[PDB]
Each structure stands twice: as structure tokens, then as C-alpha cells.
Amino acid sequence: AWRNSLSKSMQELRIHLCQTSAGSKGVRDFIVANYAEMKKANPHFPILIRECAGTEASLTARYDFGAEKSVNVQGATTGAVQQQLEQLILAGQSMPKSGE
Amino acid sequence: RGEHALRRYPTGEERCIACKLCEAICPAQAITIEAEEREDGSRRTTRYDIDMTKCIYCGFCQEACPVDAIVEGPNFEFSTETREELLYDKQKLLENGDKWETEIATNLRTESLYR
Amino acid sequence: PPSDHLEVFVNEQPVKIPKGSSVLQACDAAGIDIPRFCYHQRLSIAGNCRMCLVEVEKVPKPVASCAMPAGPGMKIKTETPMVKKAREGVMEFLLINHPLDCPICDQGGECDLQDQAMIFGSDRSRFVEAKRAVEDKNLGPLVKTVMTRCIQCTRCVRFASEVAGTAELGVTGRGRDSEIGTYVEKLMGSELSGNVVDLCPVGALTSKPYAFTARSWELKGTESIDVSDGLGANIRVDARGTEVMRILPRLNEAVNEEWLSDKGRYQYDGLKHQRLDKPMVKGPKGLQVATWQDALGAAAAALTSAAPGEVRGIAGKLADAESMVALMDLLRGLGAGDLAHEGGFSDMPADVRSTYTANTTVQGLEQSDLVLLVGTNPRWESPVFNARLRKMFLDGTQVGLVGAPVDLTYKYEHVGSDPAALAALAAGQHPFLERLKKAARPAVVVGPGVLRRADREAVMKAVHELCGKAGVVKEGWNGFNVIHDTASRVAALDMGFGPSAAARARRAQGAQPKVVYLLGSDDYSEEDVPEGAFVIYQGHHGDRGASRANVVLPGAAYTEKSGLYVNFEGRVQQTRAAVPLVGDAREDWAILRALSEVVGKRLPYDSHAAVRARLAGIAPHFANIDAVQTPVWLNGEYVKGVEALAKAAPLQPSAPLTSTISNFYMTDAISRASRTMAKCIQARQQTK
Amino acid sequence: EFATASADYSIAMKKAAEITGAAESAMGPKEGGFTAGVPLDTFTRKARIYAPARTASQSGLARTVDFATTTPAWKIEFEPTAKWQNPLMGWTSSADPLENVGRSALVFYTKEEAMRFCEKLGWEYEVTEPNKRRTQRTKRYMQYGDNFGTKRAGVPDLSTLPSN
Amino acid sequence: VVPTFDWKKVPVPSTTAKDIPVTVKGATPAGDLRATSGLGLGDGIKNHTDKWLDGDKKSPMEYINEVAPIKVKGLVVASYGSDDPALGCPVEYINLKGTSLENPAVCKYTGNRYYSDDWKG
Amino acid sequence: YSSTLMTADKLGPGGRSSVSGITATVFGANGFLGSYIVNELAKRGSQVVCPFRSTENEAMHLKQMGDLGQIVLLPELDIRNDDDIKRAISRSNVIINCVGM
């Protein structure tokens, strides 16, 4: 399952959207439908959901050593933002590893 | 209108009460004032400096002061060999006032009928 | 509507005004600033100054525009000969007994009486009699009272009775011998006691610490924000050169109206003592003056000498968002994940901003007729917020408290003092629930000391249960609110300044680092700062952290720079530099960028706008300065998603919900170094 | 009927500002700053466009946004620069060229005036909207009769009367 | 319920506590807060007069302290600073009731003290 | 001591009104090399002490080279007397000699 894997590929996952934007509807749907389970597996992973008026939908992930990648998800769907999160997880395994 | 000087009261207390009217009125910006309340509760200056190399001797300070504290004394022969000697502080102004008080008071006894 | 906006005429000008407005308010809407002495915006109508007299058609007497209601079809005249005659006579009656104290009065230059006499008065006086001599009064070390200057505008009495709620001042005597003050020798116990001098339109009430220091026109006014708490009051800074002389509040209805805590009023004095101006590195003889190059090299060597898991960063109360994010990027770039906050609860999850903010907002709170307090003391956490709470109380708003019963300057209901009482209230065991369940706009507010509890998840779960049962959060309304007492907490939460799970586990088994860095922190616990460990301190005041430190970088104080600070409601505000840098001090984020370059990993930004843009990329709302977004709400999904944290470390039903703030007058080093707060503490200790 | 401070020279300053041909002049960004002849580094600093808030010391409202159309009330400032003291006297020493030129001279009726001024001069600028004053009063003490209405302690109960 | 707060248990830093500006009797309660400026801190000066006066010369404070209070009939006294009003300070009216030789009223303009044994004492 | 001499008390960009926080006494200041040395030190904002044996006429050119209170003229220097030397360096952490024959 991707949800359980979403604890080692990255150190932080960050989400940007707008409360009232039409293109922000899909990310709103995904967050409402998935935040509980995406946190139940890992009760301490930082998942920063942030919103502001007139902004743009995007998914941004933080990795070790401060490595960070972002993908815009404006105009997509809940399945599509799930897909983008899946590619985000895919790149997370091929990253420098820290903590030790 | 000659050398600026600081006056006291006959008991010995400074006339200046740091109302800063003199600094406010001075178009030469040659007056620097710092003040706070004295240990007895009195409102007295902590820094009273006038730049004679910058003072224009207009006497507007003498016009503005409502307690006759700052006065341009009848001393006019006070040229110095260095410019630093003309950076008048509170202490030198008080010395000048104590020196020239009698003449200034006598002149005020005349000028009071006009001022 | 039945014409809620009625029409009148002022000097033949039609002006549309709301119903119940006064002629004073109408003339204000007409663009005329009528002279006035006793009326105030935030106080009740007194109407004893007689300075608001105007002329109305079909009225033989001048009417009190400060008190006269406006009737439809009314005509108001403000420039007739009788108007000016009355104004001049009133000014003359004001000035006959007033002592000639302008040269020694501190309000000269900002005296409403003086300007109003200049404009609406005459130039000559026909009074040659002996004046009335009034002895001065003692109210404490904060306010200097020159009672002979008093015009008896009664503003002090109304303010003390209404805003402060102490009601300790009154009018003694009668007629000319009418006297103002307290019959007995009393010390003004008001925490917002410094507002009276600003509200005093004359020099009768003057700030004792500010007395005879400097003049109003000698100052440069810089609009700033208050960092002494989490409310962030909008203030103006007045300075003469590089030295701060006084700090005054400024108008912000949505935040603090026209009010300022005396702590935020008198703590500027501390900026003159124990100041760090030069970099210091601990040598064999001890700490000594060294260059920024030397100090930065030593810090880089100390940082690189240790493993990434042996480096801990702690953020103080007064660190700005820029320095916090810069240091977080610095420590993350080197594999370190140990983050701590001096404001506590550094491990609290921060996924939804609404979960740790005031969703009703401060001004939206005034729409609530019922308010619930859960383990908070707004009087000592935010006296301005407490004053706004009292204002809400003044027109029917009922308040409930769950926690320690303390003096809050208004009547209230004490439901309980422990989480068991909260559980009983949520179960239905208390009548307060039904009052909550019947209130149209109920409100619940929780302080930060609750968030400092080890069982904070359980308390939050119980609060959410009560909110759901009482419908506190519903359509078009959100009575759920989270407040704080420190400014830097909100920006750290929003930027994700939180320790990694690996660092949390390392604390759990007791791993102890060797490299410790302080960002202006002086109230750390001993458990996060091991003895014998190298300490790199950045700050602007010599204090406990500085003394134990090994390398010191003289930073910038909030009065010297422009840092970002967001209050607990989530409104972005920024300070402003009023005086230049003290000593060889440098910009905090510039310091951290220099350290990053020296270590071997440069930060990708090289400007203040660049780091602010980095913040915006981290969180979009940072760009919106002096505004606030509406946070999203996710119902009980968040609570059901943090259920495991509730399972571990279960609820403690015995620990009371208290306030961790035990010293109002001293909370940070600047407060700990201020002479005025110490004087107030001694005065409160000399009353016994 | 039109009456907006209609007894002064300000009307003569209202007009001659709307003269045709003279009211259509425009310049590009940084273009006017080229004509200044001042050192080029002047435009590198940041500036604040704002109106100072009303001082808490006084109830005066003339120097506030309330009389906006009456008097130019928008100010442009610069970040303060390094300052120190004279070793011999203690007077404040500084080297800022832009220390006071704004707070003494630069005054503007509207924010857009200062925006155009900065744009044509090339000064990078920040806009800070001043807070609006509230005229509506509170529910308590809303009118003078509220000081003495029944809300203070409720309706008097007629239970202490003789014969109750 | 609503227990009292113990002010004496509050910790006070020693360094800040010992540098609070107190005052002599003068015109105020003894030992009250004294306003101070940042001048003299770099030179470590904690005396008002020491900021500007140098040496052991007689200070103006000592001069005025050598003048005994003045006994005047009535309840209100008028102070000009000189025999002729125009040569001194603006006229000041100072309350004389509740004042004694021990506790007189000091001039805010000139520092001269006055008292009256007319308030039934 | 290492770099605290040039860094601790540096106030200002480095101009005439600036303060380098450096106190020095130069011997042979009115000499050919010492004059330029003093003019170089003071122009950065340093306190300079100039004791001299020759005439004040030959030394007046040095007076302009510093700001108010930063040019110290000590006439009638005796190199055989250590009292004047002790007074010359009583406040200076830097000593520069150019007395040559």
C-alpha cells in the first residue's frame, strides 16, 4: 500500500490550494477523503495542508538533506492528484538518505 | 547679543527647566539638549550644549526663554586658538553665567521696561 | 428596512447617517471636526466639557452635539457668531484656573487643550485672581499625577470603570473644589493602566517613566507591532536618534483597537542594558571579543565536528519567521532534524491551521453571546484581549470558564477546574451545556497552557466532543479558537518548524546532542540543554543563555529590524526598524546565511525579499501582509486521525487546567532586564 | 449645491492640475530617475508608501486620512541607515543622504500619486493600507440614555414594598 | 475560590533590581520611580548631576538644600522667582494646606519651599 | 588583539565622520613619511597623537588632517625625557615611530 510507504520516501509532504477556487476542488476532495487514513498509519509524519485565496494547487514534498520537489495539480482530479502523489513517492526512494 | 550664557536664581538653582523652547526655536540647530528628572524630583537638564561655531547669535533663544535662563552676555572677546574650545557645554555656560551675572542682571533691570 | 439611515442637514449639507447617531457623529460624517474635550470613541457619553455646543434651528439654546441625538429634518449650524462666542467663552472658563505649567508640562506640543485654545479660543485674558491649588496624588510608579492641571473631563473615571473594570477612581469634593483620584492612598492595580495618560487630554496624567525625557516633536514615529505576547498590538515607536524614548499604541480595531498592555508599554527601557554588540568566542580565559569571521569559523567547525543527530536547534519567543526558516533550512541541509521551540509544545502536530488558531477571529468574537474558557487566563495572557472580552461582557455576552478561578474583572460562571469537570459538562451533567446548546453563536476558547500539557490530545478530543455536541462549529459560524502568548510560535507552526520523528524517538530513549544553537532563547528547560555541551547563542541581550554560551553572535532586536510575526488568529503582521543596528549587530537571517556559506552549504536566497518569497513558497498566506485567510475545516476527521496520540499518554483527570504564565511583568529577557517592571513588582510587594 | 472647502486658494490648486494637455503627461519606469542626475544607487533601496496613523496623544483628526481630499497625506520613507555618536560631543552621527527628505517634503493626496512618483523615479515601493476608523458605537452606552437604562441591574423588583 | 496571588514569591533578577532609580523626599514620595535616559550608561553614570557636572564643585542640589522653608500666611502662595514678576518664572499657585515645616510645598519652578500654619494646625 | 584593534570600535563607513576606534601616537609625525602616515590613519576615523620638537609653524599642516578632537598636538617634546613619551602613549594602543636622522 502507498499509504504505509508514505513514511520513508520523504520527510515532509506539503499541499497548497485555495478555499474557493474551481481548480482547487479536486485537491479539496482528495484531502477530505484521504487525510484520516494517510495519517492513521504514521501518526507523526508532517503533512502541511495550507490554503490561501487566489493561489494555485500544487503538491510539494520534502526529502532528506532538505531536498524538495513540487508538482502543480491545478485542474486535475482526486484520482489524478493521487497519481501525482504516487510519482512523488516513486522519486522518494531514489533520494539521499539521512538520520542514521 | 554676545556670548550665550546660562543663568541661575539668587539662591543658586539653575533657571533653565529644559522646556526645550530654545532648541525648538533655534534655526541654527546649534543647541543639543538632553534632560530628565533630578533625584529630588526637579526637572533639570542632563546635557546642555550650544555650538558657538554654529550659533548665529540671533538672540531668538533669549526671546523664547520664559524664565530668563539663556542670555547672550556682554562678553564678545572670547576667540580661541582651536575650534574645539568653542563647543560650549553646560558647565562652561554655567561658568559664564556665574561670571557675568551682575552685568546681565543690571542690563535686564533696564531691558525689562522694553522686553 | 424602515429607513435605518435617516437624513439631516448640517450647514445646508444633506448627510445620510445611521439611526441613533449623535450630532457629533453626524458632523464627523459631514467632514467637520468639532472641538471636544470629554467625549471619547470607546467611552460612554459624559457631556460635561460643554465644548460640543452647536446651533440647531428652532432651538434657542446651544445643544450638546456630543450627547444630542439627531432628529430627522434637523438643521445644524457650526460657524455662526454664537457658536464661536460660546467656544471662546468655554475656552476662557477652561483656562482661568488652569496653572501656567506649559514650560514644565510634558504634554506641550501634543496638548489638545493648547491647540483647541489656539484655534477656537482668544489671545488675551481678563482673569487676574488667585487660582485653585490642587495637591498631587500617588497611584503607583507608572503614572505621574499633576492634579492641578486636571480639567475634570472625567475620562479617567469612565475608562477605569468600563475598560479596566477596576473602578478605582472617582470625583471627590464639589464645585470648584471638586477633586479627582482616590480618597485613600491606593496603587493602580490595573494592568492596562498606561492607557489613561494617552486618554488624558492634558498633562494632569503623565507617564512617570517618560516624564521630562524628551518632547513629542523631537521623536521619529515608526508604526510597529507588539511582540510581548501573541496578540500583536499595532503600536508606534518614537525615538530620538538611535535611542527609543517611548512606545505608543495605534488604531487597529480588528486587533487591539486603541489599547496596549503596560508590559508592552514600559519594556522599551530594557533595550539600554546588557546589550550584545560584538561577537564573542569562548577562549581558555573565557569569552572574548572576536570578529564575525572568527566567530563564524568557530561555529562552522563546531557544527561540522559533530554528527547530524547531535545538533539541536531551539527557537525563542522573539525570533522572527525569516530567521526561523533560515535556521531550519540550515540544520535540515546538514542532516539534522532536532528542532525545539521556547514556547513549548514543539511536537504538536500542525496539519490544519484552524486547529491551532482562533477561527472566530478577534473581531468576529464580538458576535458571540456565549463564550467558553478552557484552562486559560486571558487577563495575564493578553490584557488587551481581556479588555475586549470585558467589552463583549458589557452588552449581554455570558462567559464560562473551565479551569482555575481567577479575577477577570467581570462576572462569570466557574464550571470546574479539572478535565473531569470538562467531561461532566460534555456528558450532560451540567446546566451550562444546555445554555451552550441554546446559544445562537456559542464560543469556545483555549489557551496555550493547555497545549503545554502532556495529555493535550485527550483535552483536544474532549473539547472537540463538546463542540460537536453543542454545535459550536456549524454553517456560517465557528466558535472554536486557539490562542497563544508568544509571537514566534505561530510562524514556526505555519512554516513546519517541528522536530523529526527520529529526533522525537532519540529524545524518547534519551539521546543527548553535543551542538546546541539558541535563536534568542533564554527560558529553555535543562533537559534540552545538556551541561558540558557546546552552545552557540544568537541574540541581542546578555542573559542566562548568553552566559552559558560558548559563541555569541550579536543579533537584531525587534525595535531595530523588520521581522514577520503572525498572531494567534493567523493574521500576518510585520515589525518596522525604528533605530539602526546597535553595535556591530547584523541581520539575523543574514547571520544564518553567512554561517551557511561558511559551513559549505549556501542558502539559495540572498535578499530579504528572497527569503520572504521562500516563506511564501512554503506557505502562500505569508505574502498577504496585514490580512487573514479563512481556514479550512475538516470536521472530526482530524481528531479521528490523531486518535493514536490520544491512546498513548492517556488523559490525566487530576491535573488542573492552569496558566503557565506565573510572572506577568517578566516573561522574556527584555522583560527580565526592564527596570520599570521590577519597580512595579516591588510596588506590588510593598503593599503587604 | 457644491461646498467642499469652497473659501480658499485650494480651488485654484484644484484647477491648473486638470489642464488639458498638461494632464496627459506620462513617463515610463525609472525614466524620471534618469533625469534626476543623482547617484544611481539611490534607487536600490526600498521605500514605504503609507499614511501615518493618528497619534494616541490627541483627539485631532486633521492630519489623518479623514480629510484626504483636503490635504496631501501620503508619505514616502526609507529604511533607517547606520547611525552613531560623536566621540567628542556625543551628537548623533550618520551618513544617510535620504535621511529626512521624505518625512519633510514628500506629501501626496492619494496613494496612486506616490505610486506614480516612485514608478517614474524607479523607487521600489511597498503599499500599506491604513486601518479604517470605526464610528459605530457599542451596544452598551450607545445613547446617552443607556447610561441610565434598566440594563444596569435589570427591572426593579417590587418585593420590598409595604404589604409586599 | 479566587485565591490571592503571592507577589513576594516572584523571582527578581539581582542586577536589574539594584539599579532602580529612586528619589529623595523632595517633591515626591521617597524612593518612587525616577525617570532616566540612556545617557551616562556607556560611561556607567548613575547620578543625574554627575552626567554634566565634573569635580567636587557645589551642585545646584546642595545650594537649594541650604534654604530653609518659608512661612507665609494663607492657603495659596504665589511664586514668581523674583521680587519683580517679569524677571523670573511664570506665576505658580501652590497649595499650603496640609503642609508643615517638616512637610512643606516645594516650588516646581524655583525649588523654594513654603508652608502655612493656617489649616487648623 | 589579533583583529580586535581594527574591528571592535569601528563606527561608520570609514569616512572623516566615522570612528575607527583606533588610538595611536606617531613620532616624527611632521616628518616627510610620518605626515602621510598620520593623514592616512586619521582619514579612516582614528585618534592620532602628534608630539613634536620643531615649530608649530611647521606642524600646523597636520592640524587640518584630522577632525575635531582627533588631532593631539604635544609641543616641546624631549626624547631624553620619558615623561612626555608616557603622556603621549597613555591612551594609545598603537605606537608608530618615524624619528630619524
Ligand SMILES: NC(=O)C1=CN([C@@H]2O[C@H](COP(=O)(O)OP(=O)(O)OC[C@H]3O[C@@H](n4cnc5c(N)ncnc54)[C@H](OP(=O)(O)O)[C@@H]3O)[C@@H](O)[C@H]2O)C=CC1
Ligand atoms: N627614503 C626615506 O626617506 C627613508 C626613510 N626611512 C625612515 O623614515 C623616517 C622618516 O623619513 P623622512 O621623514 O623622509 O626623514 P625626515 O627627516 O623628513 O623626518 C625627520 C623627522 O625626524 C624627527 N627627528 C629626528 N631627530 C629627532 C630628535 N632628536 N628629536 C625629535 N625629533 C627628531 C624630525 O623632527 P624635526 O622636524 O624637528 O627635525 C622630523 O620630524 C626616518 O626615521 C627614516 O629613517 C627609512 C628608509 C628610507
Ligand code: SF4
Ligand atoms: S534655556 Fe530656557 S528655553 Fe531653553 S530649555 Fe532651558 S528653560 Fe527652556
Ligand code: SF4
Ligand atoms: S542666539 Fe540664536 S543661534 Fe545662538 S543659541 Fe540663541 S537662537 Fe541659537
Ligand code: SF4
Ligand atoms: S496640559 Fe496643556 S495647557 Fe495645561 S499646562 Fe500642560 S501643556 Fe499647558
Ligand code: SF4
Ligand atoms: S485626570 Fe485627566 S482624564 Fe481624569 S478627569 Fe482630569 S483631565 Fe480628565
Ligand code: FES
Ligand atoms: S463632548 Fe460635548 S460637552 Fe463634552
